[model samples]
Target: TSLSCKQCQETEITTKNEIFSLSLSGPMAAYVNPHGYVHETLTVYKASNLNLIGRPSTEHSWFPGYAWTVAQCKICASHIGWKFTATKKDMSPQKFWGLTRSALLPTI
Candidate 1:
């Protein structure tokens, strides 16, 4: 998908949320959470645009050296995805923004 907000087609949450062009280490991740699982393999990104919802959660983190939180769309306030950030030093990736494939469109 394009990464635009499904509700509003806003690109800020996906396009603007950038730390670097090489932010993506791996393009896929599994949360294993029944509450957040999107019924299939989730496509992720290394985004950094939108603000976080809840405090950082390291407990049962999806990836090592990273914490997670809710990533809501600024335009529609919809559940866009999750944010994963490096919580330790010397980490290669500092942040990871999990963009839901269902809530986005194809990128240009």
Candidate 2:
């Protein structure tokens, strides 16, 4: 199965890892974080079919420890979420993407 932008159904975004499926429950499930990081709930996805607009940067904004890059829908170019790459070695997994739950169409 594939996930898509709720606003525009043109984009087909799928998860990268076959072993780990998208959770419907748990800490990694879909929900908004206190820091305003949207993912329905999950901290990160193994990968995504997002169309990254610009190069990844470790600049300001939010998420101080991680470098962030803007991710958008390929067709609509809407702000979906961000692809985070950890600059610190202490950070586990090192890299992942977070997508807004509201931005994604619910499973039918």
Candidate 3:
């Protein structure tokens, strides 16, 4: 399995991992983000091989104590996902990822 930048075949995520949920939520949920970028959905992951762009922030975070950093594709610089890292080592997941559906490489 694999994932990629929808507009760039130059980059690809060969490890198509499993899903997750945060804050007692299920594997999937409708989250309203700070950007409010119209209708969208997501897939959580235990790991991701993407690149981190900037510092993580706690503002408007869905999971407690997790400062999320911006993650983008290495080649095309696509908004692949976010790196949710633990600040105080909470139980949900010390580190995780959230990738949008458009990058799933047509899925399993």
Candidate 4:
């Protein structure tokens, strides 16, 4: 299956490297909200055609040892996901994108 922004199909998230799938009859994927360090259910995607709002920040939020930036849709300027980067060296899967299920179309 394929996924795109529900509001506008301007951004298309790639599933080539998908580590999880959003389904109706199975468990959903959970992602961490770096700011609160809370675990929330969200459809995680590997990459996207969305635009990065600004330079990546390493402020108070992080995924263990990584920092992230807010990712937005270029066409609609919608907050869709985040781009995470590893702070330490030799980190595997150094970077990835985590897009929310609410923002995606053809919801399961």
Worst 10 residues of 3 by lDDT: 38-47
Candidate 3 has an lDDT of 0.65
- After the best TM-score superposition of candidate 4, give how far the Cα of residue 91 lies from its true spot, in angstroms: 0.9
Q: What TM-score fits each model?
A: 0.69, 0.61, 0.74, 0.69
lDDT of 1 by residue, 1-108 (tens): 225666777554555333233324545433467377442224344553465798989887666688878887766777777777888778866776666656665532
Model 1 is weakest, by summed lDDT over 10 consecutive residues, at 15-24
| Candidate 1, lDDT over the whole model | 0.60
lDDT of each residue in 61-98, candidate 3, tens digit only: 76667888888777777777677888884455677776
Q: What is candidate 4's lDDT per residue for 16-74, written digit by digit as tens? A: 34744333332255555546554333435466677887777777653557677888777
Model 3 lDDT at residue 98 = 66
Model 1: colliding residue pairs: 1-105, 1-106, 2-105, 2-106, 2-107, 17-48, 17-49
Taken over the whole model, the C-alpha lDDT of each candidate is 0.60, 0.62, 0.65, 0.64
Q: Which portions of model 2 show Cα errors greater than 4 Å?
A: 16-41, 55-64
Among these predictions, the greatest lDDT belongs to 3
lDDT of 2 by residue, 1-108 (tens): 556777787676654232233343432454444576545533455545567878888665344677778888777778777787878899865776766666766642
Model 2 poorest ten-residue lDDT run: 15-24
Ranking by lDDT: 3, 4, 2, 1
Q: How many steric overlaps does candidate 2 have?
A: 4
Which residue pairs collide, candidate 3?
A: none
